[PDB]
Design a protein around this ligand. Structure first.
Ligand SMILES: Cc1cc2nc3c(=O)[nH]c(=O)nc-3n(C[C@H](O)[C@H](O)[C@H](O)COP(=O)(O)OP(=O)(O)OC[C@H]3O[C@@H](n4cnc5c(N)ncnc54)[C@H](O)[C@@H]3O)c2cc1C
Ligand SMILES: Cc1cc2nc3c(=O)[nH]c(=O)nc-3n(C[C@H](O)[C@H](O)[C@H](O)COP(=O)(O)OP(=O)(O)OC[C@H]3O[C@@H](n4cnc5c(N)ncnc54)[C@H](O)[C@@H]3O)c2cc1C
Lengths: 492, 492
């Protein structure tokens, strides 16, 4: 009982289950927007072995609009190249028109998580490690979680619960939400090996599709450390998961590339199995799914983390607007409406890439076809924009109407040049001279929408940005006033 | 002994083994060019069940340049549509620029074979049915075949032997030539069903990919006769070949389309198994492979017959030039050099199309990708030109040099408007004003090369056509005189 004393007033927080990249990004968005939030995680400390290294332009864009990209870049190498099914593309052909496309990074996933965690701490977010969610019960007005710590069992009440608990999501299972997909289940080994980088043959650096039917990737992770991923397709692994010894990893490396690594020591190595899935719904009452809990697929490129952080940034401001009481009706429902098809589009894109790799003998013709088609400029642009995480566009109609049957193709995308203007959060109306009145209209929403010149964002007409950076209106797409109502609610 | 008497002088013929479309087209080309030819076939009569119905623009072009297309068209329906992996394309977008692309036909394969057989008879070609080739022996200057008839065993001497004996080629096996491919082996049922066409639901007409994983095709073959092909992918058939009863065919139709056919009677039906292969070489001494004997793949569209007749027309004039004594050195070797990669390109194109269909759940993403890419104009053109048989281009360098490392992209293709000018056979120099001398140069080869105005062929500059209709030279691609030497030999 005594624990309740002296804590002061408290509003029912958004409970974020999981302190990976998804959870922490969402907690930063909630924190910035002034919503109450608690983050739980079953681990005692951050995972030093979090495996990702490819952080694409889609991720960087979201970091940039919160001023988090510089901290990540300090630990990263520019990764300007782009591939589809490990066929190399030509991103340089469109970077003049879309500079964003060249902002991807090679950077270890724990560095991203550290950047987000530090920002969450600055925004006052309480991150409760050693806390495992074991049960969930919804009520009309709140949710209650059962937790386990080394003390013992306890309860926590929130306004909302967001599953950011990874691909095997406890919460998704507790909510009884199905996770269908294509049946692509692909196994690999990931680990870190001590090397002298000068000793490496060129075929031990970078990511390679081996025509026999497998993938090898070697990328520097730190001083004298090579991060290695191997997958041998159609080979049933000795087991579907668990730790892996040097011999087994060296076995796969040599099988694929013809040669074992010049390895001093395998620091760590584990067998992973990726499932392909998209959750049938992203919302159930006051429970939401985000990141890997909502969608999973083999991590060939950077779409896992970009869909993760795109979910977090779509959801946070919407949860906060709902709690603050100004959200237009249906705002929370647009999370599923916008993110569910995007999870599916990414999941389906990995199915496409895998079907050009395995079974190798049978897929060679399709692979050669796509390689041929990728010589055309419009095909190259389509694939580059896909794999870099830059092509998502929400369906937004005239007057900013959500989920339109007649989407306006000028709306729902991004204004990359606006990122520095959005660090404070909130909506943003970019004002351009292209043909008084816009500023005047927007004044009634000045508590939710700031103003800046379109020219400070390299935009060439007036545009309205949601707090997630996506375009809800632009000059020529109907009424600004109706679009302000549709996304930001009733005038003050 | 008495059989030898009274027969008169005889030159050693080209022996064509097989009187299918490949064999008979080749015999027509040899006949027209004045070379001696005999055609053997193990069957007692033409096959009434020869299964093909899709005759693409590539086939029609070769028929047109011999005036055979009108006779076929009398039995056919225009099939202007085009597909890739049963994704429908937009051939209408390029027919303004390439009218050829819209000349494909729905016409029963026995009608093609009948047209070619009648023409072979007019050219005096002896077609010896009930003759089965059982052995082959090469000598430096001729070849000897062992034959079986209902009389008994015998021998036949030729200058050359061409295998036109189908996908299971006896001759390819006797020559010890390997037939590698991808491992795509795809089984189906083909048959003819008596129907009232008005009773058919729309899903029983045309060719359809069933998302479950199979193909159904229903096309009219004659009065009250529907030709039906079914393949159920990944279903191991009851047997790999043999006759098939109504129940089994109706089983597959209903499995695929949800509904059996309104069938009065199944006239005939058989199980087929298609192997994917391209022969490792198309020539071994005085033995050549052509058509299905040289390449095989699942018959989804019309590339089987177009590669077949393209081989026949490539080879015939070359064999004849060799026998007549005027062929430039190496001419016969250009048959393999030109046709082997084309057989492979077609075989690989069917691998590509199959890898977008099976296994259905796993390939859906790749299929959706290609459907998306096919919205672009350049992708649409690439696929249309591929599937219609219109995109082959031989590698021909400046000055008409064969097998160049630096191919001239203006050479090696066709001039479709020239077809009416080529009925007589021989080479053809099309004369245009675009910048006296060309006609003068060509005069030294007037025994092998005719002349006509480029404007009578809708060409806009001077071009030299080989007897197969392919471009060996055009104004601006180096020396006409050197190109005449490279393809037609020494000046008179
Ligand atoms: C070998 C490999 C390589 C990869 N490489 C890349 C890459 O280069 N680029 C890329 O974009 N993606 C990559 N990925 C994918 C990437 O690692 C994931 O998408 C990412 O970790 C997802 O983050 P998340 O926050 O959704 O989930 P996670 O990072 O899985 O975090 C979930 C958190 O929830 C916690 N949790 C789980 N259950 C509970 C519970 N019941 N109660 C409390 N806490 C709980 C866990 O402790 C964990 O901290 C790779 C994946 C693998 C396996
Ligand atoms: C169900 C099905 C549907 C098809 N549909 C299409 C289609 O719509 N369009 C298309 O383009 N293609 C289609 N095809 C492919 C097409 O039928 C073949 O490509 C075509 O028959 C090949 O002709 P060919 O002359 O090379 O061989 P074949 O037509 O097989 O003729 C070979 C000949 O050689 C003879 N022979 C064999 N061995 C010997 C021997 N030892 N001695 C003497 N004679 C011998 C045989 O009797 C036969 O007459 C289809 C195939 C199938 C199975």
């Amino acid at each position: 009982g005594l624990e309740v004393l002296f804590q002061g007033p408290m509003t029912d927080p958004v409970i974020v289950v999981g302190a990976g990249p998804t959870g922490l990004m969402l907690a930063c968005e909630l924190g910035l927007a002034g919503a109450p939030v608690v983050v739980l995680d079953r681990r005692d400390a951050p995972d030093p072995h979090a495996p990702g290294q490819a952080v694409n332009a889609g991720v960087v864009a979201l970091l940039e609009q919160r001023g988090l990209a510089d901290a990540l870049r300090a630990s990263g190498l520019p990764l300007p190249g782009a591939h589809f099914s490990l066929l190399w593309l030509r991103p340089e052909e469109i970077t003049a028109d879309r500079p964003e496309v060249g902002t991807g990074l090679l950077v270890a996933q724990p560095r991203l998580t550290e950047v987000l965690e530090q920002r969450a701490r600055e925004l006052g977010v309480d991150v409760r490690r050693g806390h495992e969610v074991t049960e969930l019960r919804q009520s009309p007005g709140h949710v209650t979680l059962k937790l386990r710590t080394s003390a013992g069992d306890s309860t926590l009440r929130g306004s909302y619960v967001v599953a950011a608990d990874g691909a095997g999501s406890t919460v998704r299972r507790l909510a009884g939400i199905d996770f269908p997909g294509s049946g692509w289940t692909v196994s690999g080994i990931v680990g870190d090996v001590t090397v002298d980088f000068s000793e490496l043959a060129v075929h031990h650096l970078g990511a390679h599709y081996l025509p026999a039917g497998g993938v090898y990737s070697g990328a520097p992770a730190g001083p004298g450390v090579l991060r290695v991923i191997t997958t041998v397709f159609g080979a049933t692994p000795p087991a579907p998961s668990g730790p892996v010894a040097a011999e087994e990893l060296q076995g796969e490396v040599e099988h694929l590339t013809g040669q074992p690594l010049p390895a001093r020591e395998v620091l760590w190595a584990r067998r992973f199995t990726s499932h392909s899935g998209n959750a049938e719904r992203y919302r159930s009452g006051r429970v939401f799914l985000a990141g890997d809990a909502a969608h999973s697929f083999y991590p060939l490129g950077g779409l896992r983390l970009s869909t993760c952080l795109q979910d977090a940034v779509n959801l946070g401001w919407k949860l906060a607007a709902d709690l603050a009481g100004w959200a237009p009706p249906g705002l929370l429902d647009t999370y599923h409406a916008e993110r569910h098809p995007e999870g599916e589009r990414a999941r389906l894109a990995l199915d496409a890439q895998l079907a050009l790799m395995h079974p190798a003998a049978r897929t060679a013709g399709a692979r050669s076809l796509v390689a041929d088609l990728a010589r055309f400029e419009d095909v190259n642009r389509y694939l580059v924009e896909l794999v870099t995480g830059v092509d998502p566009r929400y369906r937004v109609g005239t007057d900013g109407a959500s989920g339109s049957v007649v989407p306006d193709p000028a709306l729902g995308g991004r204004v990359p040049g606006a990122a520095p203007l959005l660090h404070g959060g909130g909506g943003l109306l970019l004002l351009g001279a292209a043909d008084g009145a816009h500023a005047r209209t927007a004044a009634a929403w000045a508590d939710r929408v700031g103003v800046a010149p379109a020219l400070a964002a390299d935009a060439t007409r007036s545009v309205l940005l949601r707090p997630d950076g996506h375009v809800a209106w632009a000059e020529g797409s109907g009424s600004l006033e109706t679009a302000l109502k549709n996304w930001f609610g009733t005038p003050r």
